Amino acid sequence: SMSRITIERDGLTLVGDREEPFGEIYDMAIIMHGFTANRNTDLLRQIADDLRDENVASVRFDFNGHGESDGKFEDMTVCNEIADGKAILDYVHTDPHVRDIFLVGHSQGGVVASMLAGLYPDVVKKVVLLAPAAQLKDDALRGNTQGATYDPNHIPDVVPLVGNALGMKVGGFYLRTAQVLPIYEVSQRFTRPVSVIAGTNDQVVDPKYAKKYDEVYENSELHMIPNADHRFSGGYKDMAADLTAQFLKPAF
Amino acid sequence: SMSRITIERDGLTLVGDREEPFGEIYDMAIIMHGFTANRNTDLLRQIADDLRDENVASVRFDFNGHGESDGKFEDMTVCNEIADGKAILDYVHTDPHVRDIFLVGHSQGGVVASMLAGLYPDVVKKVVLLAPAAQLKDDALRGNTQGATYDPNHIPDVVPLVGNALGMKVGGFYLRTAQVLPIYEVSQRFTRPVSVIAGTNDQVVDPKYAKKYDEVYENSELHMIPNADHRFSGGYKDMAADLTAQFLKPAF
Numbered sequence: 295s296m297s298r299i300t301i302e303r304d305g306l307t308l309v310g311d312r313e314e315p316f317g318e319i320y321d322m323a324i325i326m327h328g329f330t331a332n333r334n335t336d337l338l339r340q341i342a343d344d345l346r347d348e349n350v351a352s353v354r355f356d357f358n359g360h361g362e363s364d365g366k367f368e369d370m371t372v373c374n375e376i377a378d379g380k381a382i383l384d385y386v387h388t389d390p391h392v393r394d395i396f397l398v399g400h401s402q403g404g405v406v407a408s409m410l411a412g413l414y415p416d417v418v419k420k421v422v423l424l425a426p427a428a429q430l431k432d433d434a435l436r437g438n439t440q441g442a443t444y445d446p447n448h449i450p451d452v453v454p455l456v457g458n459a460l461g462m463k464v465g466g467f468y469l470r471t472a473q474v475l476p477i478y479e480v481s482q483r484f485t486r487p488v489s490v491i492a493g494t495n496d497q498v499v500d501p502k503y504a505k506k507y508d509e510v511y512e513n514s515e516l517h518m519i520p521n522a523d524h525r526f527s528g529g530y531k532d533m534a535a536d537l538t539a540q541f542l543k544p545a546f
Numbered sequence: 547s548m549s550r551i552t553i554e555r556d557g558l559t560l561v562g563d564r565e566e567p568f569g570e571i572y573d574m575a576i577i578m579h580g581f582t583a584n585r586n587t588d589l590l591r592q593i594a595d596d597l598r599d600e601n602v603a604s605v606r607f608d609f610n611g612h613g614e615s616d617g618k619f620e621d622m623t624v625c626n627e628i629a630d631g632k633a634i635l636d637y638v639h640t641d642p643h644v645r646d647i648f649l650v651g652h653s654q655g656g657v658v659a660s661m662l663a664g665l666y667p668d669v670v671k672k673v674v675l676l677a678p679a680a681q682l683k684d685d686a687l688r689g690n691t692q693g694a695t696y697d698p699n700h701i702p703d704v705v706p707l708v709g710n711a712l713g714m715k716v717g718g719f720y721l722r723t724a725q726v727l728p729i730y731e732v733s734q735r736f737t738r739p740v741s742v743i744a745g746t747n748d749q750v751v752d753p754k755y756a757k758k759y760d761e762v763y764e765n766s767e768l769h770m771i772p773n774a775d776h777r778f779s780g781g782y783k784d785m786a787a788d789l790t791a792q793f794l795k796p797a798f
Binding site: 303304305371374377413414451467476480483 | 732
């Protein structure tokens with residue numbers, strides 16, 4: 295809670311945590327979580343700790359409709375998470391302590407990070423995508439979003455989620471905008487270094503989406519972690535976080 | 547002020563006016579204004595009055611960052627005006643007085659209306675676009691937005707506007723998202739009737755953009771008003787409003 299910070303976007307308060315190394319000037323990563331997740335998952339905290347140990351600061355915010363941030367979950371879209379992203383980027387870019395700016399996204403947060411970097415290719419220095427969930431578009435086009443089914447041509451107002459997200463309702467506007475989201479076209483505009491990290495045992499997002507990111511990016515590396523799952527659980531967390539810190543290390 | 551209504555979108559209050567014919571059930575048009583304009587221009591009020599006289603209700607809201615609505619102008623994007631649009635559409639679609647739903651947009655409001663209808667092609671019944679400002683994308687790609695110039699590959703935080711909008715600052719995120727906005731691709735998804743209205747003497751938006759809307763739409767009509775300007779000023783206001791009311795008339 296010592297690390298707690300907040301910013302505003304359109305009248306919504308976004309709640310985050312700021313982690314800094316010793317010393318008053320540093321590079322800064324913006325770390326983005328996924329669909330129904332929050333800013334304090336094990337993986338995101340591990341990334342932040344590994345970055346700090348590397349003299350790289352970080353902020354991680356709950357997207358609107360998630361965690362401690364304002365907004366109903368059903369009012370969240372990928373587009374207004376990109377807007378949340380833009381507000382965080384403004385906060386970081388105008389911060390007097392910062393040198394370079396990195397984007398790190400897991401799952402749907404990797405889509406937000408990749409599109410945001412495509413819109414700010416002259417400002418963001420590097421990107422790390424961890425199992426970025428570009429499948430969310432094909433999922434919405436098919437009428438199946440993480441097990442919840444619906445007619446993709448008569449999308450209801452809200453769609454009840456199933457499984458772990460039982461009780462939660464995704465907005466129809468989330469699904470309608472997902473169907474037409476130009477994920478790779480916008481993301482492609484980022485020509486600076488990208489590292490794409492994905493588990494060979496990812497059952498939630500087909501690793502072909504991570505492969506396609508690596509194909510369209512001019513300057514990228516692909517890291518397939520054998521046997522890792524979508525969440526990078528257990529021992530895989532350390533592997534994914536290590537690769538993330540590797541890519542963003544200051545090179546002293 | 548008797549007609550005054552408000553709704554919320556993401557913590558922002560949007561202020562509008564609701565105009566109803568006699569009788570408790572009616573079709574309902576959502577009327578959208580343009581860049582730096584507001585909900586009460588002569589043309590938009592004329593459209594609303596002509597619709598009312600036709601037994602068609604209407605709402606017209608100030609977009610975020612405009613008129614009496616919340617938000618700084620520099621925080622406005624076309625994407626969060628589409629989100630404003632979605633919130634208005636929810637308010638109309640759940641209103642117990644409403645039969646069918648129409649979208650009417652002038653200038654940038656025609657872009658918001660066309661993209662919103664492309665995202666709700668099963669809900670919106672008809673669309674009227676008045677000089678829709680699809681040029682805003684090419685303008686941002688060229689680095690010239692209504693006379694204000696900037697490097698389109700190093701877009702600053704905000705760009706001061708010139709001329710009538712002197713004192714106002716458009717956000718860099720407005721310009722960055724404008725550059726990649728899939729205007730015609732999303733709008734094309736609407737296969738229901740569209741009427742595209744444009745003045746042959748339009749100096750702000752090249753009428754080739756209105757022609758392209760008519761080409762890509764499956765079910766459209768194009769009305770070129772000889773000598774009319776972009777605002778549909780003076781005697782042209784009545785002509786544009788008449789054509790709008792024509793297209794949306796109930797056919798009794």
